[PDB]
Write a protein that binds this ligand. Structure first.
Ligand SMILES: CCCCCCCCCCCCCCCCCC(=O)OC[C@H](CO[C@@H]1O[C@H](CO[C@H]2O[C@H](CO)[C@H](O)[C@H](O)[C@H]2O)[C@H](O)[C@H](O)[C@H]1O)OC(=O)CCCCCCCCCCCCCCCCC
Ligand SMILES: CCCCCCCCCCCCCCCCCC(=O)OC[C@H](CO[C@@H]1O[C@H](CO[C@H]2O[C@H](CO)[C@H](O)[C@H](O)[C@H]2O)[C@H](O)[C@H](O)[C@H]1O)OC(=O)CCCCCCCCCCCCCCCCC
Ligand code: CLA
Ligand code: CLA
Ligand code: CLA
Ligand code: CLA
Ligand SMILES: CCCCCCCCCCCCCCCCCC(=O)OC[C@H](CO[C@@H]1O[C@H](CO)[C@H](O)[C@H](O)[C@H]1O)OC(=O)CCCCCCCCCCCCCCCCC
Ligand SMILES: CCCCCCCCCCCCCCCCCC(=O)OC[C@H](CO[C@@H]1O[C@H](CO)[C@H](O)[C@H](O)[C@H]1O)OC(=O)CCCCCCCCCCCCCCCCC
Ligand SMILES: CC1=C(/C=C/C(C)=C/C=C/C(C)=C/C=C/C=C(C)/C=C/C=C(C)/C=C/C2=C(C)CCCC2(C)C)C(C)(C)CCC1
Ligand SMILES: CC1=C(/C=C/C(C)=C/C=C/C(C)=C\C=C/C=C(C)/C=C/C=C(C)/C=C/C2=C(C)CCCC2(C)C)C(C)(C)CCC1
Ligand SMILES: CCCCCCCCCCCCO[C@H]1O[C@H](CO)[C@@H](O[C@H]2O[C@H](CO)[C@@H](O)[C@H](O)[C@H]2O)[C@H](O)[C@H]1O
Ligand code: OEX
Ligand SMILES: [Cl-]
Ligand SMILES: [Cl-]
Lengths: 50, 34, 240, 144, 57, 448, 101, 97, 48, 188
């Protein structure tokens, strides 16, 4: 059940440049997150909003 | 978390210091009266 | 802190610091458990301070990994069993039998898995009878239900008290859709623990070491499938 | 309902909590002060038990540096010592009553000085205060 | 009673009918209702705003 | 007196006509002082006359006698009231003193000089005189310091003070080594008001109370001497409105803080407000309930240590969010409570299971049982218990009366700050009587 | 006889009464120390007429189930799958007309 | 101070009349609904959800439990004509208190 | 310091309690009290 | 038109003892004033049931049951008689599951009755009464347990029993006086 099977359009573009971790604690590869920091999927979304 | 606390302490102190020295700056004279 | 160092402090010097949620450290002493006189002892001040909480997660990546993914604690420093007492049996050959009777010996702990899943569990060593050599003596304990039989769910349903149906729906209640949630069970479970005697002080009758415990998590009073929670940490006891 | 036997629970004071909550009874009965004055032997036993705690338990706590336990031992089961000494002292004749009260005040200042040293965690000074406290307590018990 | 619950279904049909023989068509997007409503009202309002502004001068 | 024709103040603002009448204003303040002293004497005699030894102080609706009890008057070991004569003489002494105070207030108001400036330069003053104002401030600051020293003199040299934490049971104890260290004193002043810290409400022994009043007595005397020999500096002269109504608002704000602090003192503190006289605090009763049932259930046969409640938490004992062993249930919120009855059963790690299982004394059980039935819960018509109670018990805790009343007073006196301070600035600037139609300030301002 | 739910109650305790109107059984909320539970009373349900005719139930679980249905009046079978009915009662055209007008 | 202010004094006073009148009239519409028991008593989506997982809790579900207590404990005396004889065990109550 | 409590204020000559509208209000209070925070109390008195 | 003047300036309340005498059929007791006559029949043979206006937990029940005996000792020892009549305190029939999380109770148990007192008190007429005080505690902890004062005696082949149930929070609040008073007043 990858990203491209779920209709995700902007998620691949964040992942293409290096965004792989979420504040939810998961990683796009499936491993566990290690201190995601500001630049997560949620962080990048919040930044474009701000 | 300590970095967060120090950041908040700096921010809280800055605005409180503005408040304190703001009213010590001849505030009673800042009025339209004569 | 050692036990004597802890007693030197006052309640006001310990409150809010986190020392109260720690097991005493056994300094001096020695590692050879043969220093204990072979016989029976009264277990006292038996403490178990976890150092790691991990939860077994089914691997959707196939291969049946079922690895224990690391967690994050949600309930603060309320997770160390303390003041447990019981019986400690030590043989001439080094065989160890630990049987706990009372004390705290249980504490509700909630951790969060990667993904936002809060998995609560009743971290307990109730009725722990561990038998084995001093290197690896382990046993099986009882894991009581996380919620008691009189716990009421947000709709008032419960095992020994409360409604046995979804009163909110006066027509769709008692439907096979809600029958599982309508019926609540408070049966207990069992878990496996392994202990080790790292250090022993025969002069003060104090032993310490590490433990590893694997027990099921909360079943939501029978409304949820449990998970395996592996608890590792240090334990301390005073023989007398 | 499953039935249990708790007849012995009344002994060892099951009703102590229920006696203390009966607003029909005077405050002295509710707080147990009247009962102690009623039977001095009950109060006199508590004085003797208090002496054992000071003369035996306090020494180990100071030597082992268990400061909190030393202070707690000075207030638990000793929390009635002031009342008990007063109750026994009143029964004495007036001529001896002044002597017993004077001796008690010396002991009370001694135990307060001992408690201060345990608060400061001064082991050397606390040991000296305990020796004085034990000596003055025996003087009070002799006069009572 | 589950025997009688399914007895009626295999027997005379249930209520609420349907347009013609069958017109449920649950596959229909249903979101198309919002798409059709928004595509009508939003441009229609835009045109009506300009016309009323123009017609009043 | 005066009238609105010659003053511009209506009768409902009549005392505002005394602002510039020093002599009459002196009489008003001396007369209200006589009223305060009168009430203290009148209520002291009222409470003594209505006092029965069959019941504790907190059951009889007394709020002044507990203050005298804490000063170590007419009380014995354990908080028992042994004599009532000291309460009587205190009431008479205030009642008689109010008479002479009332005469001076009545004299200085009606017969005495209207203004003190011309005839008595020492007492005469004008509000704008920053120097004279600080001298009056300095003098009355010294008499406050002397009052604070009276408390430490009584606690150290005159009988002593009631110590509810005293070893061997609570009793009147002479303080000998008050805590005067700067770290302790500054520790109370600058700790947070939140739970566990409690600001100055958390003072937990009479050594700190007396040591604290030594600092206050010394600061006030030095501050009194300082404010006598000096005058306000340049930064102070440009930061304050120097008028009579402005000085009033400064005190209304300060007195507002004290009212709130007293409200929290009576509700939480168990050292300067012993539960033997003011009754249990809210937290004490909640802790007492779990203690009472733990004792009863242990006797009925139960390992209170491992007893699990319906929620999965400990029914009788659990851990606080920092690790201390505390009583279980909804009393978890009151784990900070520290009382002379529960502290003996509390080790460095929290409650001691061994002490709670083998070494609970009957006086501790009696104390906790009494406290849980005299919880501060009560009604306005003085029906004790929760709102769903029946009219059986006539009881409201003195702490409930003190906390509620002095919060209401504290809040209204905060509105006094807002009112009398906003007017002081407006009156001084000159637009407290309205906007001048000739030159309205907004009209000169550029449009927004 | 099951005491029917009055029209003013969203939820009503289920209580069984005899002919004289005395409570004889109920589904207790507190099951710890009950004195009227249908298990102690041994209540049974027998259906006359309709789909279930002559059928009797003695197991407490089903007796409780129909006792709750009984307090809502006559016991009917409802198809809740065709319209995905939620299960909360709704108003008749009589109720809607009165409210509107 | 507030960002928005009245500039028309006539509009200010009509508003002081419109707010209170419109408020009472809207309430009167709701009571008309309650005459027929057409009440906004519950959110079915949250009640269906709560019946499916015993973990879902909201303040709305906590109020529904409070209403259960009000109805059961009040009905016997508030409605004497109903002749309700609810025994103690059938009244809903939580643990201890 | 709660509101007025008039529960069982009116009693007849033989000691029986004649309920008022306050007692009906009390029964509603009993309903809310026993149902609020179901799993939070272990002891009968709601002191906290 | 009763014609009776109001009791203005009366001075003396008619009944202020707190108990209203009740004369039953073969028995008599002092029912507390603030208790209303209930209309439910909890147990077989209930002939009288009063419950408190405030709390329905506070209630008394008098039970007459034909037993074909003369003295209550023929029904067994005071210990045996109580065990035979354990249905008086209620049952946990509805709850059949197993649980180990009920702190202070035996495994798979949600209720427990603790017998505090047993007494073979004899009446003025020489009537053998088996009086019992028992504190029933439950897992839900309602009222903090229930005090159940029970006094029983057999006359004319009928067992006359009185059970006064009082909630614990009411017991230490003052309801103890009314409960014990009615319990002692019971006379057959
Ligand atoms: C509300 C929030 C309040 C927050 C602050 C509370 C405390 C503020 C100070 C109160 C001053 C009371 C002065 C007084 O003298 O009050 C004391 C008396 C006390 O009376 C006695 O009250 C006693 C009960 O209280 C006390 O006594 C008991 C022991 O008997 C217990 O000790 C109990 O804890 C203790 O509180 C007994 O009931 C006695 O039988 C009874 O005579 O107050 C009475 O109850 C009798 C007098 C009532 C008459 C009216 C008083 C108030 C007047 C005007 C109020 C404004 C408008 C009223 C309008 C009305 C309609 C137009
Ligand atoms: C429109 C007008 C509005 C007016 C509002 C007025 C409110 C009144 C309160 C405060 C404001 C007035 C000024 C301070 C008054 C003193 C408040 C105080 O003594 O404070 C403490 C008291 C009492 O505290 C209690 O103190 C107790 C002390 O008891 C301890 O010690 C006792 C004595 O021995 C006993 O032993 C007792 O058993 C033992 O537990 C306990 O520690 C409690 O845990 C603790 O809560 O009240 C408290 O708790 C206060 C809790 C903090 C304040 C509430 C949150 C406000 C937050 C504001 C923004 C955040 C932070 C900035 C704030 C401040 C910045 C400087
Ligand atoms: C020691 C404190 C203090 C002092 C010295 C003054 C002094 C003064 N005030 Mg001020 N005031 C105070 C506190 C104080 N006030 C507080 C706490 C408030 C908030 C409520 C106010 C609100 C206030 C207002 C609104 C006004 C004044 C005014 C005045 C001036 C004339 C007042 C007068 O003539 O009284 C007249 C006395 C009366 C009319 C009697 C009425 C009192 C009330 C209605 C009854 C109170 C009794 C009741 C039992 C209280 C219940 C309290 C309870 C709920 C807690 C005067 C110099 C006036 C002014 O500005 O002058 C320029 C004026 O308009 N004050
Ligand atoms: C603590 C309350 C208090 C006090 C101490 C004062 C004090 C004063 N007020 Mg005032 N006032 C008050 C409350 C108070 N007021 C309230 C609540 C109101 C609102 C109604 C007012 C409204 C008001 C107005 C409108 C005026 C004053 C004025 C005055 C001043 C002179 C009064 C005068 O000379 O006329 C004479 C009054 C009398 C002759 C009445 C005689 C009654 C006597 C004095 C009372 C003695 C009774 C007592 C039991 C006797 C004790 C004797 C002792 C030896 C035992 C004076 C200093 C006047 C002023 O501003 O001065 C310029 C004035 O204009 N007040
Ligand atoms: C109707 C008005 C009213 C009334 C009746 C009361 C009544 C009371 N107040 Mg309150 N108060 C009020 C208004 C009122 N207040 C207002 C408007 C405020 C400002 C908002 C306050 C602020 C306030 C505070 C901050 C406190 C009180 C307190 C008290 C209580 C004790 C009073 C006391 O001892 O003070 C002081 C006593 C004196 C000034 C006289 C004694 C002074 C000397 C120096 C004492 C020395 C004694 C000495 C040691 C004896 C030995 C002598 C020798 C051997 C050395 C009392 C019941 C106290 C309390 O109980 O807290 C809840 C307290 O802390 N009040
Ligand atoms: C009721 C008592 C009282 C009152 C009304 C005043 C009033 C005044 N003082 Mg004074 N003072 C007092 C007591 C008092 N003082 C005492 C007891 C001392 C001895 C410590 C002093 C020492 C003092 C000095 C050295 C000075 C004044 C000055 C002033 C004037 C400036 C006001 C100001 O800006 O303060 C506002 C306060 C601040 C801007 C800082 C806030 C700090 C406060 C205290 C919060 C800190 C809390 C913490 C517990 C304090 C730690 C202190 C430690 C010793 C415990 C003013 C008229 C100034 C002046 O005009 O000289 C003539 C001046 O320089 N005072
Ligand atoms: C003007 C527009 C420029 C657009 C391109 C500039 C670079 C954009 C991304 C830079 C960035 O993300 O910085 C992010 C970095 C590092 O920032 C850290 O990244 C970590 C990654 O694991 C963590 O996520 C931390 O949360 C995050 O703070 O910040 C910098 O050091 C950049 C400093 C230089 C910026 C100024 C020159 C550009
Ligand atoms: C007796 C008399 C003294 C005898 C011996 C004194 C011996 C040594 C004195 C050493 C201290 C001298 C300090 C230097 C002067 C100084 O600091 O300012 C000394 C200050 C100077 O203060 C200024 O004096 C000026 C000239 O008189 C003006 O009056 C100014 O208005 C005033 O502010 O004097 C004071 O105002 C006293 C301030 C402290 C008050 C007591 C606070 C503690 C109580
Ligand atoms: C200015 C003025 C005012 C006010 C005034 C005042 C406020 C006054 C006060 C006054 C006062 C403040 C007074 C007081 C008095 C007191 C007295 C006169 C006392 C006496 C005593 C006696 C007589 C005795 C008693 C006794 C004893 C000895 C013991 C016990 C018993 C008895 C109690 C019997 C007014 C408002 C009107 C207005 C106008 C102006
Ligand atoms: C006795 C005692 C004690 C204490 C002591 C002390 C020492 C106290 C003090 C205190 C202090 C020492 C202080 C307090 C407070 C202060 C404050 C509260 C401040 C105020 C001020 C202000 C607020 C300001 C104003 C102004 C300025 C100038 C700035 C700007 C603005 C204005 C202008 C307004 C203790 C606890 C130990 C214990 C117990 C008892
Ligand atoms: C509560 C007490 C209120 C009763 C006061 O009643 C009183 O208030 C009116 C003002 O509102 C007074 O009216 C008076 O007040 C003015 C204010 O100084 C005086 O200058 C005048 O003599 C007069 O107009 C009436 O003489 C009287 O009716
Ligand atoms: O948290 Mn909210 O509500 Ca005040 O009471 Mn106690 O706590 Mn709980 O119960 Mn009731
Ligand atoms: Cl609780
Ligand atoms: Cl709630």
């Amino acid at each position: 059940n990858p990203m491209w099977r779920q209709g995700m359009f902007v998620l691949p573009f964040m992942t293409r440049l290096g965004i792989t971790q979420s504040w939810g604690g998961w990683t796009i590869s499936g491993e566990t997150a290690s201190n995601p920091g500001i630049w997560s999927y949620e962080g990048v979304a919040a930044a474009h909003i701000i | 978390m300590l970095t967060l606390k120090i950041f908040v302490y700096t921010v809280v102190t800055f605005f409180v210091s503005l408040f304190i020295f703001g009213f010590l700056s001849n505030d009673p004279g800042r009025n339209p009266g004569q | 802190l050692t036990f004597d160092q802890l007693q030197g402090l006052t309640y006001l010097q310990v409150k809010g610091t986190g020392i109260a949620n720690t097991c005493p450290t056994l300094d001096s002493g020695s590692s050879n458990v043969k220093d204990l006189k072979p016989g029976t002892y009264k277990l006292g001040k038996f403490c178990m301070e976890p150092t790691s909480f991990t939860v077994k997660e089914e691997s959707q990546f196939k291969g049946g990994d079922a690895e224990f993914v690391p967690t994050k604690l949600m309930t603060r420093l309320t997770y160390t069993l303390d003041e447990m007492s019981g019986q400690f049996k030590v043989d001439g050959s080094g065989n160890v039998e630990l049987k706990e009777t009372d004390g705290i010996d249980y504490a509700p702990v909630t951790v969060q898995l990667p993904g936002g899943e809060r998995v609560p569990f009743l971290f307990s060593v109730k009725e722990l009878d561990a038998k084995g050599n001093a290197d690896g003596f382990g046993g099986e304990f009882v894991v009581p239900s996380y919620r008691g039989a009189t716990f009421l769910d947000p709709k008032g349903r419960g095992a020994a008290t409360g409604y046995d149906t979804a009163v909110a729906l006066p027509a769709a209640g008692d439907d096979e859709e809600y029958l599982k949630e309508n019926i609540k069970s408070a049966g207990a479970m069992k878990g496996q623990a392994v202990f080790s005697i790292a250090k022993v002080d025969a002069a003060t009758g104090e032993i310490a070491g590490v433990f590893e415990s694997v027990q099921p998590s909360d079943t939501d009073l029978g409304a949820k499938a449990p998970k395996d929670v592996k608890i590792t940490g240090l334990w301390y006891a005073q023989l007398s | 309902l499953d039935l249990f036997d708790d007849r012995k629970a009344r002994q060892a004071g099951f009703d102590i909590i229920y006696e203390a909550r009966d607003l029909d009874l005077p405050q002295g009965v509710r707080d147990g002060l009247a009962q102690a004055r009623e039977n001095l032997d009950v109060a006199k036993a508590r004085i003797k038990e208090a002496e054992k705690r000071i003369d035996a338990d306090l020494d180990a706590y100071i030597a082992k540096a268990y400061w909190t336990e030393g202070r707690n031992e000075l207030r638990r089961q000793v929390g009635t010592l002031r009342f008990d000494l007063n109750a026994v002292a009143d029964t004495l004749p007036k001529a001896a009553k002044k002597e017993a009260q004077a001796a008690k005040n010396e002991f009370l200042a001694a135990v307060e000085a001992l408690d201060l040293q345990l608060r400061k965690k001064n082991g050397d000074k606390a040991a000296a205060a305990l020796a004085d406290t034990k000596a003055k307590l025996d003087a009070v018990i002799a006069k009572l | 009673x589950x025997x009688x619950x399914x007895x009626x279904x295999x027997x005379x049909x249930x209520x609420x009918x349907x347009x013609x023989x069958x017109x449920x068509x649950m596959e229909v997007n249903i979101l198309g209702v919002i798409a059709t409503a928004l595509f009508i009202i939003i441009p229609t309002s835009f045109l009506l705003i300009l016309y009323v502004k123009t017609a009043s001068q | 007196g005066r009238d609105q024709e010659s003053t511009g103040f209506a009768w409902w603002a009549g005392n505002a006509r005394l602002i510039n009448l020093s002599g009459k204003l002196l009489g008003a303040h001396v007369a209200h002082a006589g009223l305060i002293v009168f009430w203290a004497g009148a209520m002291n005699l009222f409470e003594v006359a209505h006092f029965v030894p069959e019941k504790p102080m907190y059951e009889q609706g007394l709020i002044l006698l507990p203050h005298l009890a804490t000063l170590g008057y007419g009380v014995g070991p354990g908080g028992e009231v042994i004599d009532t004569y000291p309460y009587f003489v205190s009431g008479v002494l205030h009642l008689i003193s109010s008479a002479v105070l009332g005469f001076g207030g009545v004299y200085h108001s009606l017969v005495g000089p209207e203004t003190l400036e011309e005839s008595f330069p020492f007492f005469g003053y004008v509000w704008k005189d920053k120097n004279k104002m600080t001298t009056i401030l300095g003098i009355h600051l010294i008499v406050l310091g002397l009052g604070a020293w009276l408390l430490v003199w009584k606690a150290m040299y005159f009988g002593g003070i009631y110590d509810t934490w005293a070893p061997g049971g609570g009793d009147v104890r002479i303080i000998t080594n008050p805590t005067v260290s700067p770290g302790v004193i500054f520790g109370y002043l600058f700790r947070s008001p939140f739970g566990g810290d409690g600001w100055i409400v958390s003072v937990d022994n009479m050594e700190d109370v007396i040591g604290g009043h030594i600092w206050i007595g010394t600061l006030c005397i030095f501050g009194g001497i300082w404010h006598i020999l000096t005058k306000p500096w340049a930064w102070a002269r440009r930061a304050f409105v120097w008028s009579g109504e402005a000085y009033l608002s400064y005190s209304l704000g300060a007195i507002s803080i004290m009212g709130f602090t007293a409200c929290c003192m009576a509700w939480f503190n168990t050292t300067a407000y012993p539960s033997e006289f003011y009754g249990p605090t809210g937290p004490e009763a909640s802790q007492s309930q779990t203690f009472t049932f733990l004792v009863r259930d242990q006797r009925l046969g139960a390992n209170v240590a491992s007893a699990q409640g319906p929620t999965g938490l400990g029914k009788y004992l659990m851990r606080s969010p920092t690790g201390e062993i505390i009583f279980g249930g909804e009393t978890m919120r009151f784990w900070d409570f520290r009382g002379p009855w529960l502290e003996p059963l509390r080790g460095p790690n929290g409650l001691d299971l061994n002490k709670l299982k083998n070494d609970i004394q009957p006086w501790q059980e009696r104390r906790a049982a009494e406290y849980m039935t005299h919880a501060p819960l009560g009604s306005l018509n003085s029906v004790g218990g929760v709102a769903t109670e029946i009219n059986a018990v006539n009881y409201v805790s003195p702490r409930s009366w003190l906390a509620t009343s002095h919060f209401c007073l504290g809040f209204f006196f905060f509105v006094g700050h807002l009112w009398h301070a906003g007017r002081a600035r407006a009156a001084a600037a000159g637009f407290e009587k309205g906007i001048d139609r000739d030159n309205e300030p907004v009209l000169s301002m550029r449009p927004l | 006889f099951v005491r029917r739910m009055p029209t003013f109650f969203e939820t009503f305790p289920v209580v069984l009464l005899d002919k004289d109107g005395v409570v004889r059984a109920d589904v207790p909320f507190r099951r710890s120390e009950s004195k009227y539970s249908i298990e102690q009373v041994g209540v049974s349900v027998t259906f006359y007429g309709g789909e279930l005719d002559g059928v009797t139930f003695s197991d407490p679980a089903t007796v409780k189930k129909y006792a709750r249905r009984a307090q809502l009046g006559e016991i009917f079978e409802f198809d809740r799958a065709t319209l995905q009915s939620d299960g909360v009662f709704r108003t008749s055209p009589r109720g809607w007309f009165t409210f509107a007008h | 101070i507030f960002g928005v202010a009245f500039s028309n004094k006539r509009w200010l006073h009509f508003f002081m009349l419109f707010v209170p009148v419109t408020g009472l009239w809207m309430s009167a519409i709701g009571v008309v609904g309650l005459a027929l028991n057409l009440r906004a008593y519950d959110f079915v989506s949250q009640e269906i959800r709560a019946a499916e997982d015993p973990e879902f809790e909201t303040f709305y579900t906590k109020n529904i439990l409070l209403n259960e207590g009000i109805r059961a404990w009040m009905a016997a005396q508030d409605q004497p004509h109903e002749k309700l004889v609810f025994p103690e065990e059938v009244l809903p109550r939580g643990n201890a208190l | 310091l709660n509101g007025f409590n008039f529960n069982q204020s009116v009693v007849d000559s033989q000691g029986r309690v004649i309920n008022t509208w306050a007692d009906i209000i009390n029964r509603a209070n009993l309903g809310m009290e026993v149902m609020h925070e179901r799993n939070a109390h272990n002891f009968p008195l709601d002191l906290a | 038109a009763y014609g009776d003047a109001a009791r203005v300036f009366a001075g003396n309340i008619t009944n202020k003892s707190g108990f209203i005498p009740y004369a039953g059929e073969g028995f008599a007791l002092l029912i507390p004033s603030k208790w209303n006559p209930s209309k439910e029949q909890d147990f077989p043979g209930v002939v009288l049931r009063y419950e408190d206006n405030g709390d329905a937990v506070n209630n008394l029940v008098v039970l007459v049951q034909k037993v074909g005996k003369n003295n209550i000792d023929e029904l067994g020892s005071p210990d045996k008689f109580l065990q035979d009549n354990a249905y008086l305190f209620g049952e946990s029939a509805a709850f059949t599951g197993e649980t180990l999380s009920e702190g202070g109770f035996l495994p798979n148990k949600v209720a427990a009755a603790s017998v505090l007192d047993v007494q073979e008190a004899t009446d003025k007429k020489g009537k053998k009464y088996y009086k019992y005080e028992v504190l029933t505690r439950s897992a839900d902890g309602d009222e903090g347990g229930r005090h159940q004062l029970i006094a029983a005696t057999v006359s004319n082949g009928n067992l006359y029993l009185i059970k006064v149930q009082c909630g614990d929070k009411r017991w230490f609040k003052g309801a103890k006086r009314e409960a014990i008073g009615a319990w002692d007043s019971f006379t057959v």
